[PDB]
Design a protein around this ligand. Structure first.
Ligand SMILES: *[C@@H]1O[C@H](CO)[C@@H](O[C@@H]2O[C@H](CO)[C@@H](O[C@H]3O[C@H](CO)[C@@H](O)[C@H](O)[C@@H]3O)[C@H](O)[C@H]2NC(C)=O)[C@H](O)[C@H]1NC(C)=O
Ligand SMILES: OC[C@H]1O[C@@H](O[C@H]2[C@H](O)[C@@H](O)[C@H](O[C@H]3[C@H](O)[C@@H](O)[C@@H](O)O[C@@H]3CO)O[C@@H]2CO)[C@H](O)[C@@H](O)[C@@H]1O
Ligand SMILES: OC[C@H]1O[C@@H](O[C@H]2[C@H](O)[C@@H](O)[C@H](O[C@H]3[C@H](O)[C@@H](O)[C@@H](O)O[C@@H]3CO)O[C@@H]2CO)[C@H](O)[C@@H](O)[C@@H]1O
Ligand SMILES: *[C@H]1O[C@H](CO)[C@@H](O)[C@H](O)[C@@H]1O
Length: 437
């Protein structure tokens, strides 16, 4: 995709903290950019849309390279159009933003090191911490902070058709191999475009974009999970059609990434009073979330540990109480037992498990922060009973939301002013971001 400048692109600023062994932390001046799929896509020579509603203009261009050449993405009106604001080390993403001519739903954003480069993190062996407020995030919504193995420049150095780069939030990928991206590998995803049946702005193209994914945080004020998702190809790669896998496909496991992950949800692991409104981890208030990516002596990822801090008390992750799935952290062995007790597909195992996730964590990964609703499962996998008839079966109950919650059109209409606030990002070696773990 080319880049256009009918609208100035000014990344909202966002500071974060790099911490050293001993607890000393240094302020870093970063910023954030919005993902290209939310941007205006128009012809390079006019304001005429190349993509509008849920369609491409195929009277103008009709294949990947030519649309990538004749179309561009433009700047983004962060606050008034997308409901994205920052202040200091704090980022607020609003759910539905109604402007004069348009309605924006959700957002996906990336931390920048510079105007043209995502801030890369190498997580293995290290510690990542942030504060989050999910208090205004109800059933059916997901405020997500995670890492994916995108390239720092959005793919510019790999794909000559991508002339927009990280500045315009290009190059996305995750463990769902998403096919709704309008540009992948520097080529517009216009071939075999099929409009979504329930999302007025979306469709899927011939191609999807895969890469490793570490879901540090997927949460609302009812339920939370952290989930590694390995891929048999570590970095960004293009997939084709149904072989992409991911959930907007016929066989979600048919592709190269694990679409389920090895998930830890306190509620799903059997502790229903640990996380929620006024609970041990109280979701009406700001929560500090600590994640440690531990190595074994061979240098592989052996364990993911979670701690919470609220009002100065360190709260270790809740004990999983599912019989046979004892433990409060994610390990290969724990994941084997979890999949067994829940009767779930061992795709995590088949695609390389912890060791394969650690290969991604050893490399650079992009930090992404988003807010969204779910046009496939109404977020029931996160905060409800899933499958909907599975009450009493181990693994089915994930939160206390009703099985009728989460329908995008309904939650968009009822809770449009929902929002999530990510703030106070701290990163460094183990023990460096919060004292007294
Ligand atoms: C869900 O996770 C909760 C936090 O991990 C956990 O709360 C903990 O409950 C125990 C009760 O067994 C409390 O222990 C208190 O009582 C014992 C015995 O009287 C004392 O020896 C302890 O020192 C303590 O005072 C913990 O305080 C409490 N932890 C927190 C952080 O509140 C729940 O038990 C878990 N629920 C399930 C079903 O496992
Ligand atoms: O097309 C321009 C239009 O896009 C809207 O954002 C879309 C994104 O284009 C789309 O990628 C995203 O898809 C997410 C979906 O909503 C979720 O259910 C789930 O599947 O994850 C997807 C992202 O990976 O949906 C949004 C909403 O349709 C903007 O809201 C809009 O302002 C803009 O004009
Ligand atoms: O991230 C983008 C994509 O995520 C989809 O949700 C996934 C979850 O990420 C995934 O963890 C979950 O996996 C569950 C699985 O579906 C069930 O079979 C269960 O038994 O085990 C897993 C534990 O949760 O699946 C969902 C469904 O795909 C969103 O649906 C999608 O909208 C979004 O774009
Ligand atoms: C069209 O089809 C989608 C496929 O996921 C359904 O979920 C929905 O009913 C939409 O109307």
């Amino acid at each position: 995709q080319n880049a256009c400048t009918l609208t100035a692109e000014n990344h909202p600023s966002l500071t974060w903290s790099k911490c050293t062994s001993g607890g000393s932390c240094t302020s870093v001046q970063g910023s954030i950019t919005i993902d290209a799929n939310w941007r205006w896509t128009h012809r390079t020579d006019s304001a005429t849309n190349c993509y509008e509603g849920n369609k491409w203009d195929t009277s103008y261009c009709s294949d990947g390279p030519s649309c990538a050449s004749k179309c561009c993405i433009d700047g983004a009106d962060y606050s008034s159009t997308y409901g994205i604001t920052t202040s200091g080390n704090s980022l607020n993403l609003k759910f539905v933003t109604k402007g004069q001519y348009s309605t924006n739903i959700g957002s996906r954003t990336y931390l920048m090191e510079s105007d043209t480069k995502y801030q890369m993190f190498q997580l293995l062996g290290n510690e990542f911490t942030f504060d989050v407020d999910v208090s205004n995030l109800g059933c059916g919504l997901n405020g997500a902070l995670y890492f994916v193995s995108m390239d720092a420049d959005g793919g510019m150095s790999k794909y000559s058709g991508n002339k927009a780069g990280a500045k315009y939030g290009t190059g996305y990928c995750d463990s769902q191999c998403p096919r709704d991206l309008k540009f992948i590998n520097g080529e517009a995803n216009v071939e075999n475009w099929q409009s979504s049946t329930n999302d007025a702005n979306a469709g899927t193209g011939k191609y999807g974009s895969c890469c490793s994914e570490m879901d540090v945080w997927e949460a609302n004020n009812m339920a939370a999970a952290f989930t590694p998702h390995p891929c048999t190809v570590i970095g960004q790669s293009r997939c084709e059609g149904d072989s992409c896998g991911g959930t907007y496909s016929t066989d979600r496991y048919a592709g190269i990434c694990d679409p389920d992950g090895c998930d830890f949800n306190s509620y799903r692991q059997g502790n229903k009073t640990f996380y929620g409104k006024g609970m041990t981890v109280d979701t009406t208030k700001k929560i500090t979330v600590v994640t440690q990516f531990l190595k074994n002596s061979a240098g592989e990822l052996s364990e993911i540990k979670r701690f919470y801090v609220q009002n100065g008390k360190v709260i270790p992750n809740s004990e999983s109480t599912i019989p046979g799935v004892e433990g409060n952290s994610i390990t290969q062995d724990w994941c084997d037992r979890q999949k067994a007790a829940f009767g779930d597909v061992t795709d995590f195992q088949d695609k390389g498990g912890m060791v394969q996730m650690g290969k991604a964590l050893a490399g650079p990964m992009v930090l992404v922060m988003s807010i969204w609703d779910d046009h496939a499962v109404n977020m029931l996998w996160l905060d409800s009973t899933w499958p909907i008839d599975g009450a009493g079966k181990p693994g089915a109950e994930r939160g206390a939301c009703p099985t009728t919650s989460g329908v995008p059109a309904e939650v968009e209409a009822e809770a449009p002013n929902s929002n999530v606030i990510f703030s106070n990002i701290r990163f460094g070696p183990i023990g460096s971001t919060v004292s007294g773990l």
